[PDB]
Amino acid sequence: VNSFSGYLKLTDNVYIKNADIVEEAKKVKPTVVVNAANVYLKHGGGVAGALNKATNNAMQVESDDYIATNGPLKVGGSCVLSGHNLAKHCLHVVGPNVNKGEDIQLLKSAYENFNQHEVLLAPLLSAGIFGADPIHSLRVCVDTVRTNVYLAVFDKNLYDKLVSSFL
């Protein structure tokens, strides 16, 4: 048993809810919150900008030190950093950004990072401002992640659309 509440069960291991991941993180304080990162860990907008804002920019300060030491991530890759005031850990995962011209096949590789963690609170990778089809992102998630994932969908109208179209 875990502390996630009000989720719609999609499969054995995938759950979904219409919620802001920042508000869910603050309430649950999960072991792992996933950030929809870019390779530079520059948290300007979307999930990244909102989580970073909720950490009072501490996420960005930590991220800049990580990049100065290690260089950029790969598209499809990830790193584990602090969850600050939101979670124990933040798993920064880079899905492909369609609005930059990256290969959507890399979305499966991005979701594979979730399998290194038994339970995660996570967003739909590559959706929203990343430019991919969210119905597709949900399908790849269900077909790739084997650990227990609690998906927070921010957009109310998109949430209704994802549930009603789910196979």
Ligand X SMILES: Nc1ncnc2[nH]c3cc(F)ccc3c12
Asked if 21 is part of the footprint of ligand X (rule: CB under 6 A), the reply reads yes
Tell me how far, at minimum, the Cβ of 23 lies from ligand X, in Å.
Answer: 8
Asked if 30 is part of the footprint of ligand X (rule: CB under 6 A), the reply reads no
Asked if 154 is part of the footprint of ligand X (rule: CB under 6 A), the reply reads yes
* Choice from 13, 20, 29, 136 touching ligand X (CB under 6 A): 20
Asked if 83 is part of the footprint of ligand X (rule: CB under 6 A), the reply reads no
For the beta carbon of residue 97, count every other beta carbon within 10 angstroms: 18
Q: What is the CA radius of gyration of the chain?
A: 15
* Choice from 15, 25, 33, 46 touching ligand X (CB under 6 A): 46
Asked if 95 is part of the footprint of ligand X (rule: CB under 6 A), the reply reads no
* Residue ranges in contact with ligand X by CB under 6 A: 20-22, 46-47, 50, 123, 128, 152, 154
